[PDB]
Amino acid sequence: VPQELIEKIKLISPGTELRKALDDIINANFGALIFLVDDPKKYEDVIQGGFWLDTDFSAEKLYELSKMNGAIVLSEDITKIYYANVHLVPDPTIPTGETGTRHRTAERLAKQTGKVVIAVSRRRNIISLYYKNYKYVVNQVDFLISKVTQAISTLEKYKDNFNKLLSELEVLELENRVTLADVVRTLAKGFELLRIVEEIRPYIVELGEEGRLARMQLRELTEDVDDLLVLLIMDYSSEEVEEETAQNILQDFITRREPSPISISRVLGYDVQQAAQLDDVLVSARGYRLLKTVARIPLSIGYNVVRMFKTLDQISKASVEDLKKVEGIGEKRARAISESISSLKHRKT
Amino acid sequence: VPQELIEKIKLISPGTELRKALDDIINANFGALIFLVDDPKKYEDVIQGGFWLDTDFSAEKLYELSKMNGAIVLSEDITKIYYANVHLVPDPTIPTGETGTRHRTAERLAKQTGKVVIAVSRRRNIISLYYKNYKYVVNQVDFLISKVTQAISTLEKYKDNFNKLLSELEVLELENRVTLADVVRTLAKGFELLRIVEEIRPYIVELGEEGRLARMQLRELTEDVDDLLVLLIMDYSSEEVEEETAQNILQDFITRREPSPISISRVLGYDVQQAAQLDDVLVSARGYRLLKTVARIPLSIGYNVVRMFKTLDQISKASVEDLKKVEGIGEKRARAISESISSLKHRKT
Ligand SMILES: Nc1ncnc2c1ncn2[C@@H]1O[C@@H]2COP(=O)(O)O[C@H]3[C@@H](O)[C@H](n4cnc5c(N)ncnc54)O[C@@H]3COP(=O)(O)O[C@H]2[C@H]1O
């Protein structure tokens, strides 16, 4: 979905005076056919009849005008009403797959001029936006709230399962009993969860000002999940991996690749092709997750800690003095590392 | 109103199945937009979308299809329905005086193709027919009947006054006391009566089958007025006048010139400059009106009677023996001429 078109969709998103007018028009079963231009003179050959207005835009004015037959011409910045009650005459030879004169005119006119045209028919409650060779149908808020509320409820269930997987993983991590199956299962659930977020994003955007609570909910449910998955990938990949690399593996499984167990464990660098194999592959966390998240050790410095001790298990055996040899670890960070791991072992295992 | 257009108007006149369908369509407040062509696949460029039907016409089929959006395509003789639900796309650059997409389309397409296009708007009850550069509005029957009923009632009054003038003139004629004013006064009323018939004629045509009674009424009211006015012109023009010329006089004051007293007398060959002079000009009927109408003498033979006796006054003094000396007058025509005049002189004077 081009960014060019997304800028146009903003024009009619909940919160704008234009959208407010269009909601009133839909509510009254008036139709609408609206043409957005910056220089009316340049387009005087596709504009016939009607009334020259040249007056400041308002929602109420647009509403009143739409009671009349034909079309309305506004400035692109939606600050002026230029014409009302006009006949729009785009080139009839331009292909269109729309139905009815109103929507066939709209799509032809947008194709012909490279401008936005908005059509509302009298009996439906959708707003059809046309820009160049684009068509975007904009939905009512109540339809969008419904899908988004469902998506959020779905995200809650994925997130709860993710937390359960993770808390079990933690236990296994601290006891050094993790298998590849355990990692992959946890990553998959994380990947799927953020996929759902990506898929609902267009709905969220369409909601405009009415999507504010929805965005807050997404943010709260997904807050640290991306960082968490990146750290897991750095901790459990077959060979050592830089952060931005792990970030890309996340990007890949969120958007382009399917998060099947074999696919994940393969891209983590393991050579398995049967799902049952994962249970037999023993893995040991590098320790990045615990270092950044719990001991609050910056990644740049955690590299050196992993450089020296290789795995979490060995880090958990190091004394404060042992840790202090690392490039970046003073007594502050050394006790942070030492005490936070041991605290965790005590309470969790 | 060119004969070419009148033929097309017949297509939608009361009585035709097409008009019966348009009537229902008007009554249901469906609109209509109908394109008449014999070769559909040649007009492929101006007809988009819709359904190809190619089915035999009926009023009920047309009505049913008019429920759908857009336009309908029929054969020029209204025998086939070719398309329904189509989008008509005439050249947008053709000048049009119409208002609304429907009527602006109809006019432009009619001009572009030389074919009939019919448009009915949803809330108005008229049928607008476009043919080439012609536009003809066809009215509802109740409207036409009201005008025609008034026009006929108006005619009864003119006709009553014409009769009263005529019978007064009859008396003056039989007593040889006719002035040019009496003649002109009678002619003028007859002229005006026939003008009214001319003005109402388009409404009557427009009424189609619903104008049968109205035609009979006009026929009864005017059936011999024209012949009567022709014979008056032949009896009172200053210089002898052939029948053909007299009919051309009649035709002139019915259409071209206005039947003013001075003007009528001037055309009759009397150098008059003021209406008050008409009362001083004495005239004598040659006798054609009486010879044709009352004695049943053919005009051809009439001339021979007039060339001999010059005026009605002299004819009324001629004996049977005198009259038989005329070419074409046997003993029966002679006694027909003499007894009909003496009979009228006895009864009317
Ligand atoms: N070229 C054509 N070919 C076939 N049928 C034609 C036609 N032009 C008009 N009609 C028919 O007349 C109906 C009423 O059009 P109206 O202009 O009143 O109402 C129109 C008009 O107010 C507006 N609108 C549509 N096209 C427009 C255009 N090019 N320019 C400006 N306004 C337009 O959309 C309304 C709904 O049109 P809708 O199609 O439902 O219904 C149309 C359509 O069925």
From Swiss-Prot, chains A, B:
Binding-site residues for 3',3'-c-di-AMP, renumbered to this chain: G70, L88, T101, T105, R122
Q: How is its activity regulated?
A: Inhibited by 3'-dATP.
Query: Which reactions appear under catalytic activity for this entry?
Result: 2 ATP = 3',3'-c-di-AMP + 2 diphosphate
Q: Could you give the cofactor binding note from the entry?
A: Crystallized with Mn(2+) to trap in the pre-reaction state.
**What Pfam family is a match for this entry?**
HHH
Keyword Translocase in record: no
Q: Which InterPro entries match?
A: DisA, DisA_sf, DNA_integrity_DisA_N_sf, DNA_integrity_scan_DisA_link, DNA_integrity_scan_DisA_N, DNA_integrity_scanning_protein, HhH_motif, RuvA_2-like
Q: Which UniProt keywords apply?
A: ATP-binding, DNA damage, DNA repair, DNA-binding, Magnesium, Nucleotide-binding, Nucleotidyltransferase, Transferase
Reported cofactor(s): Mg(2+)
Q: Which domain of life is it from?
A: Bacteria
Q: Which terms under GO biological process does the entry name?
A: DNA repair
Broadest EC class assigned to this enzyme? transferase
Task: State if Magnesium is listed as a keyword.
Answer: yes
> Domain DAC spans what residues?
2-142
EC number in record: 2.7.7.85
Q: What SUPFAM superfamilies is this protein classified in?
A: RuvA domain 2-like, YojJ-like
> What are this entry's molecular-function GO terms?
adenylate cyclase activity; ATP binding; catalytic activity, acting on DNA; diadenylate cyclase activity; DNA binding; hydrolase activity
Its quaternary structure?
Answer: Homooctamer.
Q: Which HAMAP family match?
A: DisA
Q: Which family is this protein grouped under?
A: Belongs to the DisA family.
Q: What is the recorded function of this protein according to its Swiss-Prot or TrEMBL entry?
A: Participates in a DNA-damage check-point. DisA forms globular foci that rapidly scan along the chromosomes searching for lesions.
Name of the protein:
DNA integrity scanning protein DisA
User: Which species does this protein come from?
Assistant: Thermotoga maritima (strain ATCC 43589 / DSM 3109 / JCM 10099 / NBRC 100826 / MSB8)
